[PDB]
Design a protein around this nucleic acid. Structure first.
Ligand SMILES: [Mg+2]
Ligand SMILES: [Mg+2]
Ligand SMILES: [Mg+2]
Ligand SMILES: [Mg+2]
Ligand SMILES: [Mg+2]
Ligand SMILES: [Mg+2]
Ligand SMILES: [Mg+2]
Ligand SMILES: [Mg+2]
Ligand SMILES: [Mg+2]
Ligand SMILES: [Mg+2]
Ligand SMILES: [Mg+2]
Ligand SMILES: [Mg+2]
Ligand SMILES: [Mg+2]
Ligand SMILES: [Mg+2]
Ligand SMILES: [Mg+2]
Ligand SMILES: [Mg+2]
Ligand SMILES: [Mg+2]
Ligand SMILES: [Mg+2]
Ligand SMILES: [Mg+2]
Ligand SMILES: [Mg+2]
Ligand SMILES: [Mg+2]
Ligand SMILES: [Mg+2]
Ligand SMILES: [Mg+2]
Ligand SMILES: [Mg+2]
Ligand SMILES: [Mg+2]
Lengths: 116, 145, 49, 102, 112, 47, 153
RNA sequence: ACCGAUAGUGAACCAGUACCGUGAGGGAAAGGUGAAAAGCACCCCGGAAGGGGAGUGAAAUAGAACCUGAAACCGUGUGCUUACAAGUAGUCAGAGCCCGUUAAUGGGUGAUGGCGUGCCUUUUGUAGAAUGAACCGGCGAGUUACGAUUUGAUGCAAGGUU
RNA sequence: UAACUUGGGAGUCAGAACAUGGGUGAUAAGGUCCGUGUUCGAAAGGGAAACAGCCCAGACCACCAGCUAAGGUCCCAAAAU
RNA sequence: GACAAUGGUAGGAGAGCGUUCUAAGGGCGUUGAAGCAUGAUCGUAAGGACAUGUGGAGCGCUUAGAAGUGAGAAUGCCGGUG
């Protein structure tokens, strides 16, 4: 019973090409090179989803420290006093308070300054 | 995914300043000026778009250098022709074209990417006078840190 | 018992592995031989003893 | 109106009346489920507090305990020949907050 | 309406009547024969033979007015190629591809 | 004296962009019903 | 081996700039040569003589111990009438698959019932094991029923 | 439980034929309109080839290079986008403008920021300036018989077996 | 928390750099040859500007959560002018 | 509910999808089969579906067998196109 590769192939390569759209030029039209580029695109995808957790708590550190020294407090003396204040808040909140609504953060900086 | 305030064009304001180039010794000034241009003291900092705000430096001749580097710290430039390093500007460059003395030394502090060299154009240095930007309403900031 | 639902013996049919049919079988590209040398060539094998 | 609640381990800003995605919390669809762990119940007069602030964030009703969009992990080591790929879909339970109790 | 007329095997190459055909699209069809009559290219009458043969289908068939039409589209696809040999040096041959070309214009009043 | 690289489908089309042909003068005769080429005389024109 | 042609060595070796290709009928040409074809062989093994009866006493005991068996007395008719047997299959009702068994021969029962779909007429010493579980209904004469225990037990 | 036109004999097709060799001898490619020829009467541009109507036919987008028609590749107007820019071409953030889904934490485009030297063989080690691939299809590599030893299965038991 | 006895199935017999005890070399080598450890080979991440072998530490996957190691805290670039 | 374990080459050990044919049972097919193109859907992978076009006649699904069974590299072979 001789069996040849009848459409176990072209029904397989047209879910790589269709899964690889919008690449430049001739890496979205043809298999043997565009199999490589999707094959790196997972290898990036596993890598950089460990950068969004290394980038956004690098963003918030800027926009807190930009707002901490608008009240004569550097960032380093702030969260020392904030931890002694017994405040278990994140940074992403402490951003989002200090950019929409100053008057909340206007007294939050006091409580950390008053523990010191 | 979650919420984080990503400020935008037509969501950001930009204002102006004036710094007097008094006896701060060119690093103590031209470090802190670079953090002003990147908006890094303003709270609504989103790095993928250009925040920040303009800076005019006015008198630009009261710059000094401690130590004996008034004749050292030589500058260089290559013309891409052979034999063409032009060391003819020592660090005593203040006697002629002193505007290019600090306007070099902010564009080294800023990143050289395709947004930073746009952002380096938000700087102005003037000779010794008052600025010709009277029709712009600058303010004063003079205490750098 | 009946034809259309016959079930085999209880741990008696094991299917034989085709060797050298993909990198994700555990026998990929070299199919159990090694890299080079006497054993890895076709038809090679020393006389026993 | 303005409060800071927490679950999973992370923290979620409320903007009272809205609907926020959050991960799998156990009681079923359409019921009444509340929180109790408020680290900051602000509002018109902010009342910052201790490990808790002793004020219950109000019960949000539960909708749609389905699973997230499919993400595709795929890694490999370069020239020595290896492959891994496997699918992954993460659950989420959205919920509409309705009020607040300071 | 939109009348059209093709020629289905023309002896010239596609890339060489791609020049003159990409020069008369979207013009007044009355003088459009005269642009083809006043060059000196290869198939400048051969397109002109077809474009005369497309106006003459806009009379007996569709009764559109031959006042002044307008050419919406004109293009030329690759035809079935002919493959030959030619000997050059040290016993080796090198193939010569005598290509062929379809040709297709459409002519229309524009209005519906 | 060979190529090192097949030129892609961008520097094929970007290279041939200064390879065109322009129309000639095409001033009409007064009584030909036919367009002569400028500074020329046809065979069956008002030229 | 057995394809025609191939003694030529087409390219030489060093110098030409093609592969190191050997003949014209190597397997990776579009010519013949198949490296691992099917050798004409035979498909036949055997069980021991005790196991070879224990299946067969288990096949028809699957019928009798649950759901279906019928023993009829003998029946003769000389002229071959197909219609006089399809008559009989629907009186004592059986489904479409049905197996009749004569004792050693039948000049008519082997020669009637040979047209109907779903009927097999097998002499009691030709009792194999596929059909006896392919069918659903044993209908046997009473003369062979006493013999099959006297020959399988 | 043999193949269905790169398979099957080399050879389904006016095959050991074209074709190459002085010779002995090598040795290909090439199947399919429809149910039936009903194989496009006539009208029109063109010298003709072709073509637009009309007409046969369930279908001519089935027109004698003829069923089905995929990829490389060469083209046609288009929605977003590009002429101060340093680039293994992506990925993750994210603005603005256009479209509305197997209705789901929606699809396409991307001004700007982080992050970053393809794949396989071979190696003490490779982006490697080490080798291999122009690209897209199709074909193409642990098989069978006979034995020997081993675990897993199933009959019988001091007996088992042709 | 292993060890050993028996029986099926192999792969390796081209290693490398650091840290130290040594021969050879010229107290020369990214040299060669032994001992003994680590890591790479067969290990991705963070630091050493980039950099298989040095310094921390071992990736089952998700999340816009917190502490910390090696190295750092004027700017490019997170944090003390 | 716990409790621990899950980098990985040569190589050893398990569980798996898909392709062609047969046996048995049970079906879908001119009110449109197999292939072909397009799509935002489902499973942990290989993969499985469902609508819509084109297509004109022979296919699936469960159980169980037998193998000419899977393609990206061999300066591979042949046919096309740059
Ligand atoms: Mg194949
Ligand atoms: Mg292995
Ligand atoms: Mg491989
Ligand atoms: Mg070996
Ligand atoms: Mg090898
Ligand atoms: Mg070796
Ligand atoms: Mg050999
Ligand atoms: Mg075919
Ligand atoms: Mg012939
Ligand atoms: Mg009709
Ligand atoms: Mg196409
Ligand atoms: Mg560079
Ligand atoms: Mg090795
Ligand atoms: Mg190179
Ligand atoms: Mg090459
Ligand atoms: Mg040494
Ligand atoms: Mg050692
Ligand atoms: Mg180890
Ligand atoms: Mg680095
Ligand atoms: Mg940098
Ligand atoms: Mg593992
Ligand atoms: Mg194994
Ligand atoms: Mg089939
Ligand atoms: Mg290939
Ligand atoms: Mg070559």
């Amino acid at each position: 019973p001789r069996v040849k590769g009848g459409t176990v192939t072209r029904a397989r390569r047209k879910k790589t090409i269709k899964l690889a759209k919008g690449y430049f030029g001739s890496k979205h039209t043809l298999y043997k090179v565009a199999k490589q580029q999707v094959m790196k695109s997972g290898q990036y995808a596993f890598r950089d989803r460990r950068q969004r957790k290394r980038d956004f708590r690098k963003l918030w550190i800027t926009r807190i420290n930009a707002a901490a020294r608008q009240h004569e407090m550097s960032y380093s003396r702030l969260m020392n006093g904030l931890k002694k204040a017994g405040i278990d808040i994140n940074r992403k909140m402490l951003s989002e308070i200090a950019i929409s609504d100053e008057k909340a953060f206007a007294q939050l900086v006091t409580k950390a300054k008053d523990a010191l | 995914m979650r919420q984080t305030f990503m400020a935008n064009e037509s969501n950001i304001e930009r204002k102006w300043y004036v710094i007097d180039a008094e006896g701060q010794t060119l690093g103590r000034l031209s470090s802190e000026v670079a953090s002003i241009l990147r908006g890094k003291n303003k709270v609504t900092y989103t790095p993928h778009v250009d925040t920040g705000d303009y800076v005019i430096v006015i008198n630009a001749s009261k710059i000094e250098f401690t130590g004996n580097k008034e004749t050292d710290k030589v500058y260089y430039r290559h013309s891409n022709h052979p034999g063409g390093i032009k060391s003819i500007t020592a660090g005593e460059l203040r006697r002629t074209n002193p505007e290019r003395l600090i306007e070099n030394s902010i564009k080294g502090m800023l990143p050289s990417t395709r947004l930073g060299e746009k952002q380096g154009k938000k700087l102005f240095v003037y000779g010794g006078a008052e600025h010709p930007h009277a029709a712009q309403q600058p303010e004063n900031y003079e205490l750098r840190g | 018992m009946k034809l259309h639902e016959l079930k085999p013996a209880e741990g008696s049919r094991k299917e034989r592995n085709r060797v050298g049919r993909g990198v994700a079988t555990g026998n990929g590209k070299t199919s159990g031989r090694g890299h080079k040398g006497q054993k890895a060539r076709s038809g090679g094998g020393v006389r026993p003893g | 109106m303005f409060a800071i609640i927490e679950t999973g381990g992370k923290q979620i800003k409320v903007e009272e009346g809205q609907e926020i995605f959050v991960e799998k919390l156990d009681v079923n669809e359409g019921d009444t489920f509340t929180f109790d762990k408020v680290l900051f119940v602000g509002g018109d007069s902010v009342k910052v507090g201790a490990p808790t602030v002793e004020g219950a964030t109000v019960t949000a009703t539960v909708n749609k305990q389905g699973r997230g969009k499919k993400i595709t992990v795929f890694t490999y080591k370069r020239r020595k020949n290896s492959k891994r790929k496997k699918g992954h879909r993460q659950p989420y339970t959205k919920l509409t907050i309705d009020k607040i109790n300071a | 309406m939109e009348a059209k007329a093709v020629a289905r095997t023309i002896r010239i190459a596609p890339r060489k009547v791609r020049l003159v055909l990409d020069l008369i699209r979207g013009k007044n069809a009355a003088e459009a024969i005269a642009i083809l009559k006043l060059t000196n290219k290869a198939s400048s009458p051969v397109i002109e033979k077809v474009l005369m043969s497309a106006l003459a289908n806009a009379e007996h068939n569709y009764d559109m007015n031959t006042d002044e039409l307008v050419v919406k589209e004109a293009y030329a696809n690759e035809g079935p190629t002919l493959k030959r040999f030619r000997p050059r040096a040290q016993g080796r041959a090198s193939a010569i591809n005598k290509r062929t070309s379809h040709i297709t214009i459409v002519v229309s009043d524009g209005k519906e | 004296a060979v190529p090192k690289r097949r030129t892609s489908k961008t520097r094929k089309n970007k290279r041939r962009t200064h390879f065109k042909i322009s129309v000639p003068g095409m001033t009409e005769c007064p009584n030909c019903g036919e367009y002569k080429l400028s500074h020329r005389v046809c065979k069956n024109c008002g030229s | 081996s057995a394809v025609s042609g191939g003694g030529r060595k087409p390219w030489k070796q060093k110098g030409t700039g093609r592969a190191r290709q050997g003949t014209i009928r190597a397997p990776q040409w579009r010519g013949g040569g198949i490296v691992f074809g099917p050798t004409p062989r035979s498909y036949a093994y055997k069980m021991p003589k005790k196991m070879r009866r224990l299946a067969l006493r288990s096949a028809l005991s699957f019928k009798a111990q649950e759901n279906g068996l019928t023993v009829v007395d003998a029946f003769n008719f000389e002229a071959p009438k197909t219609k006089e047997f399809k008559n009989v299959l629907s009186t004592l009702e059986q489904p479409k698959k049905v197996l009749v068994v004569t004792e050693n021969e039948d000049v008519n029962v082997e020669l009637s019932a040979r047209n109907i779909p779903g009927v097999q007429v097998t002499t009691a010493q030709g009792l194999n094991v596929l059909d006896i579980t392919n069918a659903d209904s044993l209908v046997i004469t009473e003369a062979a029923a006493k013999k099959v225990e006297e020959v399988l037990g």
